[PDB]
Coordinates of C-alpha atoms and ligand atoms in Angstrom, one line a residue:
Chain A
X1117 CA -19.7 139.9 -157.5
X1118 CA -17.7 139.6 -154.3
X1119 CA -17.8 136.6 -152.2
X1120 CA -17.1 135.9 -148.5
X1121 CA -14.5 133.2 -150.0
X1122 CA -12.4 135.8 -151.5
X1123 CA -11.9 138.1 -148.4
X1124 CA -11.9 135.6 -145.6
X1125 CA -8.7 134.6 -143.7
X1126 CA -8.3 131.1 -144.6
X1127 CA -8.4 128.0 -142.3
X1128 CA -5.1 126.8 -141.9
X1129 CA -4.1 130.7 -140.8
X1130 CA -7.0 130.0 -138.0
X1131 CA -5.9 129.6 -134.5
X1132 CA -8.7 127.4 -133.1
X1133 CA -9.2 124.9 -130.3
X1134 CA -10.4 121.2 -130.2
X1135 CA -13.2 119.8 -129.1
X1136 CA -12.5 117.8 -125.5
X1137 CA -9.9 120.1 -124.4
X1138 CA -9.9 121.8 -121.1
X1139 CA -10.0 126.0 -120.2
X1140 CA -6.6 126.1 -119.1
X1141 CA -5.7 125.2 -122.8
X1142 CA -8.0 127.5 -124.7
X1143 CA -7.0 130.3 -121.9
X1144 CA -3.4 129.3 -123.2
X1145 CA -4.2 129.6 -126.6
X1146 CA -6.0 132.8 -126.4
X1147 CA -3.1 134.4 -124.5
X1148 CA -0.6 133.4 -126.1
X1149 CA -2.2 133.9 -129.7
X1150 CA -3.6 137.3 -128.1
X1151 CA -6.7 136.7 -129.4
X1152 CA -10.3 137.4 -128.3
X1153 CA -12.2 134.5 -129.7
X1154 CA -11.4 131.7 -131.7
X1155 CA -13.0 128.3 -133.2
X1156 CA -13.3 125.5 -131.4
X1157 CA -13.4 122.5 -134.4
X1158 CA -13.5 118.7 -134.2
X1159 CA -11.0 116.7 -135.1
X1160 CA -13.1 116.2 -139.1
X1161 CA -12.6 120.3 -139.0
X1162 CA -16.3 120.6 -138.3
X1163 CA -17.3 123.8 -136.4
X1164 CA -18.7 123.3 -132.8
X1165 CA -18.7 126.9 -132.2
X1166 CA -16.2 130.1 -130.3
X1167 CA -14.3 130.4 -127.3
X1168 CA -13.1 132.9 -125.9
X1169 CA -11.6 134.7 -123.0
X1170 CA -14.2 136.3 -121.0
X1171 CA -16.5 133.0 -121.4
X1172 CA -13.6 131.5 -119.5
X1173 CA -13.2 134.4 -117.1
X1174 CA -16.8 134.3 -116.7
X1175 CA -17.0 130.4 -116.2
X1176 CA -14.5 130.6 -113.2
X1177 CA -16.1 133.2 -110.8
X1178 CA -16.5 131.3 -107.9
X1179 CA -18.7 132.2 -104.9
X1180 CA -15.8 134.2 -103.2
X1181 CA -12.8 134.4 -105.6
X1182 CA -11.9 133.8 -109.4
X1183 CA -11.3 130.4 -109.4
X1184 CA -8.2 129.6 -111.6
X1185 CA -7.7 126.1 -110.7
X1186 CA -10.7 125.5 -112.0
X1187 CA -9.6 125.5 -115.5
X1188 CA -8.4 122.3 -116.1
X1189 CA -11.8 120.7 -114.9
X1190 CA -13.9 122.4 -117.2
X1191 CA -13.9 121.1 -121.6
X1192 CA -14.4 124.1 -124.3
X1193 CA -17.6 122.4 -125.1
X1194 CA -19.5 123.4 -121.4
X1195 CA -18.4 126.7 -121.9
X1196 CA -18.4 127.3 -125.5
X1197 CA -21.1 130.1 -127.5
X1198 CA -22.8 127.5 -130.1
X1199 CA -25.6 130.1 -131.2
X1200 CA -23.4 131.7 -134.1
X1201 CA -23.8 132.5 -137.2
X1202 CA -22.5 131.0 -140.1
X1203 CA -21.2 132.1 -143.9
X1204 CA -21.0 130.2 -146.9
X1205 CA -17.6 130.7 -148.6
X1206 CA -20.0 131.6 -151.9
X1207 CA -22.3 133.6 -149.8
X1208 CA -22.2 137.8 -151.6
X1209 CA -19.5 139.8 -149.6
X1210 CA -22.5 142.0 -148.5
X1211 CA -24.1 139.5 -146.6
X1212 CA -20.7 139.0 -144.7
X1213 CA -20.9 142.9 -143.7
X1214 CA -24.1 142.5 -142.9
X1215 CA -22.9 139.9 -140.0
X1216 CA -19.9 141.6 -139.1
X1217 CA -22.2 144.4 -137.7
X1218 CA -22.5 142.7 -134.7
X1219 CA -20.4 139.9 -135.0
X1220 CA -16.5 140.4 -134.8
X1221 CA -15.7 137.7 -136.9
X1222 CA -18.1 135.2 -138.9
X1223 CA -17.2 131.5 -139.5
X1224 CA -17.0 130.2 -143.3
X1225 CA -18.5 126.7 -144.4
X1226 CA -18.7 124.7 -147.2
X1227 CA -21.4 122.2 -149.0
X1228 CA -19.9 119.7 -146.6
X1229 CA -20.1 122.2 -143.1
X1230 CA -16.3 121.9 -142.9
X1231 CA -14.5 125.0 -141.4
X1232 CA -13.2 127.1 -144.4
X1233 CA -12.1 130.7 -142.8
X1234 CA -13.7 133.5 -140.9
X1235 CA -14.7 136.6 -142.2
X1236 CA -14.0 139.5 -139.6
X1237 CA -14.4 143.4 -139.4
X1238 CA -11.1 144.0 -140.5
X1239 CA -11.2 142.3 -143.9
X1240 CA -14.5 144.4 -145.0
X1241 CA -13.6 147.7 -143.3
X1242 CA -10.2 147.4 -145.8
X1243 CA -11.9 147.1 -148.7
X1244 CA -14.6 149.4 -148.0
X1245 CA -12.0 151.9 -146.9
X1246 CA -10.5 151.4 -150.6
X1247 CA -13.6 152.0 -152.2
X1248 CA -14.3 155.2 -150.3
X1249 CA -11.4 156.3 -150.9
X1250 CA -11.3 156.2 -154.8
Chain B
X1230 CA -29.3 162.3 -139.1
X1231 CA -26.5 163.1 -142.1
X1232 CA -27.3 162.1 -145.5
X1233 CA -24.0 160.2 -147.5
X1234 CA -23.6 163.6 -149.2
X1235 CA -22.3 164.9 -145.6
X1236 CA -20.5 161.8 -144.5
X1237 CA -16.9 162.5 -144.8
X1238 CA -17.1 166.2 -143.6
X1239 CA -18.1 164.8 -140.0
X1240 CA -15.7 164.2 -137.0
X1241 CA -14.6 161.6 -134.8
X1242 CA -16.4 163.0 -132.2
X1243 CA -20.2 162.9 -133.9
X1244 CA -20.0 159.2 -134.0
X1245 CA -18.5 158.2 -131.0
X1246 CA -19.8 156.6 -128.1
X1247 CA -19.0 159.4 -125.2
X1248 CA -17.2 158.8 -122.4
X1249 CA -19.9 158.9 -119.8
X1250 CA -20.9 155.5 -121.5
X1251 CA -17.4 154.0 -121.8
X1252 CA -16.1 151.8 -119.1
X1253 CA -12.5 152.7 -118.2
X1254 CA -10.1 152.2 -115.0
X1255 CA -7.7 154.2 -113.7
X1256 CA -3.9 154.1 -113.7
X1257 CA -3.7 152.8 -110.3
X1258 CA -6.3 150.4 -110.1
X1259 CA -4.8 147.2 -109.3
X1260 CA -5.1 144.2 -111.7
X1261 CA -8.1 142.6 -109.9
X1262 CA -10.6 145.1 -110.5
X1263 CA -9.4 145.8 -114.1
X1264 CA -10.4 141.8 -114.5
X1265 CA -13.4 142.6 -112.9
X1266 CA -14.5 145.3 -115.2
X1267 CA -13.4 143.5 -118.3
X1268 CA -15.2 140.5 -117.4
X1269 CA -18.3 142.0 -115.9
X1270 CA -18.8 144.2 -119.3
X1271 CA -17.4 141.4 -121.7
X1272 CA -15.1 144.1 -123.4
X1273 CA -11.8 143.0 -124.6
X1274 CA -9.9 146.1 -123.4
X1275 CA -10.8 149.1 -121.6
X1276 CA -9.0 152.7 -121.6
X1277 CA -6.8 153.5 -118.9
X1278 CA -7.2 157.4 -117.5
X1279 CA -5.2 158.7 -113.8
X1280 CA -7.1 161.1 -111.7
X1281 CA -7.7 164.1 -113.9
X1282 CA -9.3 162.2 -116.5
X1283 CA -6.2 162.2 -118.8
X1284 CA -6.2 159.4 -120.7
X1285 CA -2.9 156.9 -120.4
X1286 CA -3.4 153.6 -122.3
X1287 CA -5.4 150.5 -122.5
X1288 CA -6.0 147.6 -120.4
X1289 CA -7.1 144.3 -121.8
X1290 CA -7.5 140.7 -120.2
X1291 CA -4.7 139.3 -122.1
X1292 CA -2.4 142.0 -121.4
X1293 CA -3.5 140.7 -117.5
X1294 CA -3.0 137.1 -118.0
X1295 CA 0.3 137.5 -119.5
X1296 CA 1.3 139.4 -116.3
X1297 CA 0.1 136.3 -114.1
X1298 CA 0.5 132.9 -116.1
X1299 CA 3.6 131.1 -113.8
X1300 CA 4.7 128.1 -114.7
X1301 CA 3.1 125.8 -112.4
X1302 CA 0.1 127.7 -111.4
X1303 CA -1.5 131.0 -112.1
X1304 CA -0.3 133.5 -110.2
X1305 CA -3.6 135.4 -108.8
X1306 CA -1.9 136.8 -105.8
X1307 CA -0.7 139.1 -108.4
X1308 CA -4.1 140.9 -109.0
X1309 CA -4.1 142.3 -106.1
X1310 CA -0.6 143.3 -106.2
X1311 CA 0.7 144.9 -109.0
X1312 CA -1.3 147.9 -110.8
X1313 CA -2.9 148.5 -114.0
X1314 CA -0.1 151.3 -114.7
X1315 CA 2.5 148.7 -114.6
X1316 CA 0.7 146.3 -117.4
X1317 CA -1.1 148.8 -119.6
X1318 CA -0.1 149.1 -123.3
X1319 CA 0.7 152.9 -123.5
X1320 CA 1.4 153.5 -127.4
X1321 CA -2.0 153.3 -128.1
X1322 CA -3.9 154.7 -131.2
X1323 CA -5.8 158.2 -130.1
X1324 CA -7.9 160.4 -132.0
X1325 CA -8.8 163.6 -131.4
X1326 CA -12.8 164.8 -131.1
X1327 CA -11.9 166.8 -133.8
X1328 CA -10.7 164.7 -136.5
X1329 CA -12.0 164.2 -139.4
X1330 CA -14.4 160.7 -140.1
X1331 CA -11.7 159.1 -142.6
X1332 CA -9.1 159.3 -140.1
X1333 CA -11.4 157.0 -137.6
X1334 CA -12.2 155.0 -140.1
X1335 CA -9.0 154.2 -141.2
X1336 CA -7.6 153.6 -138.0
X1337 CA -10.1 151.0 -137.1
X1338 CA -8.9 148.9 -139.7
X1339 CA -6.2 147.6 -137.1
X1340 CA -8.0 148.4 -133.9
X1341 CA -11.6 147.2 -132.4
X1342 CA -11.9 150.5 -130.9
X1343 CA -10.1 153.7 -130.6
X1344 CA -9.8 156.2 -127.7
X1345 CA -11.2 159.8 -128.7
X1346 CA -9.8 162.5 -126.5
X1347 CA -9.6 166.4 -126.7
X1348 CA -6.9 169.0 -126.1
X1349 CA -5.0 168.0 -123.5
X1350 CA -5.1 164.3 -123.7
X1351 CA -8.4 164.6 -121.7
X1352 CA -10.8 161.4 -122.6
X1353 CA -14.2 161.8 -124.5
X1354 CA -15.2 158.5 -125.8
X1355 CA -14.2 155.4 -127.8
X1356 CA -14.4 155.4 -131.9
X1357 CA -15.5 151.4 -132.9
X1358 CA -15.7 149.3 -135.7
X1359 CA -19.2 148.4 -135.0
X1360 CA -20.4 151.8 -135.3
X1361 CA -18.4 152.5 -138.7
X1362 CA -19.7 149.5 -139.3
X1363 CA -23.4 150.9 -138.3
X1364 CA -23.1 153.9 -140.2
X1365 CA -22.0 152.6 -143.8
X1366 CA -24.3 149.8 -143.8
X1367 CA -26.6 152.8 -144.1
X1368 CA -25.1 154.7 -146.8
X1369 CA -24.0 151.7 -148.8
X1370 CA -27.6 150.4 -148.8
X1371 CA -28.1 153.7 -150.4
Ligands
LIG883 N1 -5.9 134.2 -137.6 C1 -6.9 134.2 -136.7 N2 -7.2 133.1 -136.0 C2 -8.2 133.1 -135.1 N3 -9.0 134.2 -134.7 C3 -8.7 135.4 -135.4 C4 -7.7 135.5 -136.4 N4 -7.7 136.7 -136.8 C5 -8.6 137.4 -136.2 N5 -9.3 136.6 -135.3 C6 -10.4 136.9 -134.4 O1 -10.9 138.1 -134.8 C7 -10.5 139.1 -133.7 C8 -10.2 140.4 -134.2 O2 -8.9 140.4 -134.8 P1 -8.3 141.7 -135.5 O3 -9.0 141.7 -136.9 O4 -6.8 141.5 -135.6 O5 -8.6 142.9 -134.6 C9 -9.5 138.4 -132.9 O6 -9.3 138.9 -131.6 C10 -9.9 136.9 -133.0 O7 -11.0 136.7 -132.1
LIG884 N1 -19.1 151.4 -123.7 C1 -17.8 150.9 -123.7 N2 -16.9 151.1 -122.7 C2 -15.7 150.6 -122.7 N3 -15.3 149.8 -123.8 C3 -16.1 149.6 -124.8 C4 -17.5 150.1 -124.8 N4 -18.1 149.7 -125.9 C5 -17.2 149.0 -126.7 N5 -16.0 148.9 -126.0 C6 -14.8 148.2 -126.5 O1 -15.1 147.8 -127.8 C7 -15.1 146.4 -127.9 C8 -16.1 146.0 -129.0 O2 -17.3 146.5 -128.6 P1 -18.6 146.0 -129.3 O3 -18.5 146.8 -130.6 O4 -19.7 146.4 -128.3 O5 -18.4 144.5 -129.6 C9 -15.3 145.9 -126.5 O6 -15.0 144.6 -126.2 C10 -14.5 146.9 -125.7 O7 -13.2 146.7 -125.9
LIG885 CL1 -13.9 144.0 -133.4

């Protein structure tokens, strides 16, 4: 039936970060991509796991003030969630909505466990809306 | 407690999660403690209500950082300074408690969350993905 492969957004429309890069540059990215929570891949577009802005915020509270100049001194990879769960771009589209419950978005894999897409809430709650509907 | 039968004559307000449970700010909080509250809860952005609990818009941390990334530095002395009426995004989605299901669900399509209010613009809860989510895992199962 429906696969995860078919409904995901695809890789290369992914904003991600890179493994070895500092805070300051995934806060940039974040901001300036507005986005919650994004990839962090390595350089053979292998999934290391998310990043996102209130890990950052979060990493930074120092004993008396958030401490912004912090940023550049800490890598994604300190800070990063690597306990995520993971789709397989021929995995049933049910098992992706399954995830999504409490999962914004779920990263997509293939045989080789190279980043292929993510699967978010918005992608199933469209097509489920157009099923409802008719 | 509704069977799939009785899904789609429900409101907004059944399903969401009420206001006495939703973390908000007001309009003139400053920047600081809308940080604070967005990063102590982990939410990505809060609703924004002034004194008689009318809600105004939402707050989010990127809406915050945008207001203080400088060129050189980041600009914290701004959290203190400038207010979360001055950085809010004010055209926001809104439901009413009223509404009917469909109209929540299709709204989150775009949005995480969206504000529920009554008459009046007075705020009663937040409408999510997670629990439309929630609720047709159940009926779709069956
Ligand atoms: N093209 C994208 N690249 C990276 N992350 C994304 C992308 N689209 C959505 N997301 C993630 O999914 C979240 C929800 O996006 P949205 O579906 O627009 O509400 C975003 O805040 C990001 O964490
Ligand atoms: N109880 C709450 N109070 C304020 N905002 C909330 C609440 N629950 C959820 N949210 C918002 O909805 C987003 C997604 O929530 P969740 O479905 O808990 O991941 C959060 O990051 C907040 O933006
Ligand atoms: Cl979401």
């Amino acid at each position: 039936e429906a696969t995860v492969g078919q409904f995901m957004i695809e890789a290369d429309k992914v904003a991600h970060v890179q493994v070895g890069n500092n805070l300051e540059h995934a806060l940039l990215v974040l901001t300036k991509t507005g986005y919650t929570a994004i990839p962090v891949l390595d350089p053979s577009y292998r999934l290391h796991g998310l990043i996102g802005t209130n890990m950052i915020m979060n990493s930074i509270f120092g004993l008396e003030r958030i401490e912004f100049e912090k940023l550049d001194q800490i890598t994604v990879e300190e800070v990063m969630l690597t306990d995520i769960p993971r789709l397989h771009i021929n995995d049933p589209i049910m098992k992706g909505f399954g995830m999504v419950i409490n999962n914004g978005f779920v990263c997509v894999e293939n045989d080789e466990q190279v980043f292929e897409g993510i699967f978010t809430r918005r992608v199933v709650l469209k097509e489920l809306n157009k099923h409802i509907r008719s």
